Design a protein around this ligand. Sequence first.
Ligand SMILES: CC(=O)N[C@H]1[C@@H](O[C@H]2[C@@H](O)[C@@H](CO)O[C@@H](O)[C@@H]2O[C@@H]2O[C@@H](C)[C@@H](O)[C@@H](O)[C@@H]2O)O[C@H](CO)[C@H](O)[C@@H]1O
Ligand SMILES: [Ca+2]
Ligand SMILES: [Mg+2]
Ligand SMILES: [Mg+2]
Lengths: 285, 286
Amino acid sequence: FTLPNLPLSSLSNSRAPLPISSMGISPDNVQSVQFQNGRCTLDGRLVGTTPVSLSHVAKIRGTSNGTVINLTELDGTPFHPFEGPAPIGFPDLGGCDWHINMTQFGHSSQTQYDVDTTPDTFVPHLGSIQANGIGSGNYVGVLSWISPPSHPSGSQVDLWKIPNYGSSITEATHLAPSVYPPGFGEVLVFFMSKMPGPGAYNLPCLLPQEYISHLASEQAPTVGEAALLHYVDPDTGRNLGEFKAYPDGFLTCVPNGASGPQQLPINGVFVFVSWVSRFYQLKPV
Amino acid sequence: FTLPNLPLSSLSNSRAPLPISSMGISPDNVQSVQFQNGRCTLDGRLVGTTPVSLSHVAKIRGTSNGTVINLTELDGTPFHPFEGPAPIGFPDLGGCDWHINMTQFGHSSQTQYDVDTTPDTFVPHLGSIQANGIGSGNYVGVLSWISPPSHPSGSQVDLWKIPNYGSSITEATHLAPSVYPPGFGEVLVFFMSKMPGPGAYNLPCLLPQEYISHLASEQAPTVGEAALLHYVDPDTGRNLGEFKAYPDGFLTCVPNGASSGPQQLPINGVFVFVSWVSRFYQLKPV
Ligand SMILES: CC(=O)N[C@H]1[C@@H](O[C@H]2[C@@H](O)[C@@H](CO)O[C@@H](O)[C@@H]2O[C@@H]2O[C@@H](C)[C@@H](O)[C@@H](O)[C@@H]2O)O[C@H](CO)[C@H](O)[C@@H]1O
Ligand SMILES: [Ca+2]
Ligand SMILES: [Mg+2]
Ligand SMILES: [Mg+2]
């Protein structure tokens, strides 16, 4: 079994096309996460709206009629509600407004599309989102920057959330399931990127995008209960810390105090060591 | 040795962050190319301005003073002329004007940056490009759409070219070398993507980006003269055509005239390494 032999700082976020700047852990008020992008099992199963390629990450495609944008997949093929909470690659950043850069095949210009994901018109699961002034036409959009949510008024930016893909929060939208810290002092490890906008926004994801393409290619025929990893400094070969990767597609470690993986340098490489028990006890970082 | 076990249609261009829509060949007035992005050898050596990740492809970073933008690497670290023709990831699309979307850490808004790559102020090899009205500040920019070059005046979009990175065409800028078709009668295979802008623009590259990160991770210890590949339909296992991958990081096939060839092939296939063969191994026409 392998993970990419590439330093983290050379890789991308899987929730937006941004370089990885650090690893991190969630705030204490966040336990589980339910990201829809950046979801891939260790045997190569893409989950949620996750694409193989970063060229599809945090993008939209659709036709505006001036009132709504009727969404398709990125290549123009139809999207249907049975397929997921939104088309493949659709942004999954909750807790913020989006500003999406819209361009067109065969036309000049770009247009900023401002997206509040809270109103009842934002129903990407049913293939429809408000146009909010975007004129009639077919567009491809990519997430460019974010800002605080328009509703509730005065809300903070909380990128540990996902948007409401349905007409209400009680509508079933085929979300990929939540990911939980597995217990016994283990914390979920996140890969972070700086996101432009009017604040110091840091976007967490569960796996770098290049890990997703690697795993989806590798299609490991063997996956055990948990993969013991070392985070290694490439030049010296020094083991900087033990981590576990779990079959559902996430990494953990046991921090040695509040001052964790966030302290580790970001130019290391995760290396598979061996398959271990689900309850294998890690050495604190 | 391995290439990604992923269909081409799931992958990205390596010269802009765009899905692959087809394979193609160059026009018959283009033999060689000198792309600076999308360059990786079979043993994992990144060449030119090529980055490991698509998150760095066709991007810029720098500080405007209102007149010039002084460039850095994407992460803010200094760029110096000895390092290359431009910072890693810098766009390499010749034969067009660029329209770059500029954003800022800590500020609202985006700004369009219009780039004519022909004037003597466009000197990314020396770390400086004209601001063209972009106000003072630090920005990250990504290529968004393209249009015909502003100069010379009435010329067509030509994405087989690279820009002039230096003060003049005679300045040495440490370009990655040109790639030529090798023989006989093998053609260079290009991976194409649709690029937004006021025309039917198709952007060629030599390798999907995910091949680059794969090869850079793999660091193959035993590369031979040429890799014999099959382009396989995953479901049926049918070999749709024999191809060769060459050490310098490009693929070829022999089209059966103009009835079979890269453009006629479905884009949902997977390239599979078969074996190492001699440089002069003759392929069966596609
Ligand atoms: C943003 C724009 O689409 N740029 C391309 C476009 O520019 C020309 C047209 O927009 C035209 C419409 O009447 O007006 C011209 O002013 C404009 O020229 C561009 O901007 C001026 C200020 C000068 O800097 C010109 O050198 C520059 O081209 O079309 C041109 C080709 O005509 C280019 O593709 C521009 O990128
Ligand atoms: Ca909503
Ligand atoms: Mg790694
Ligand atoms: Mg392939």
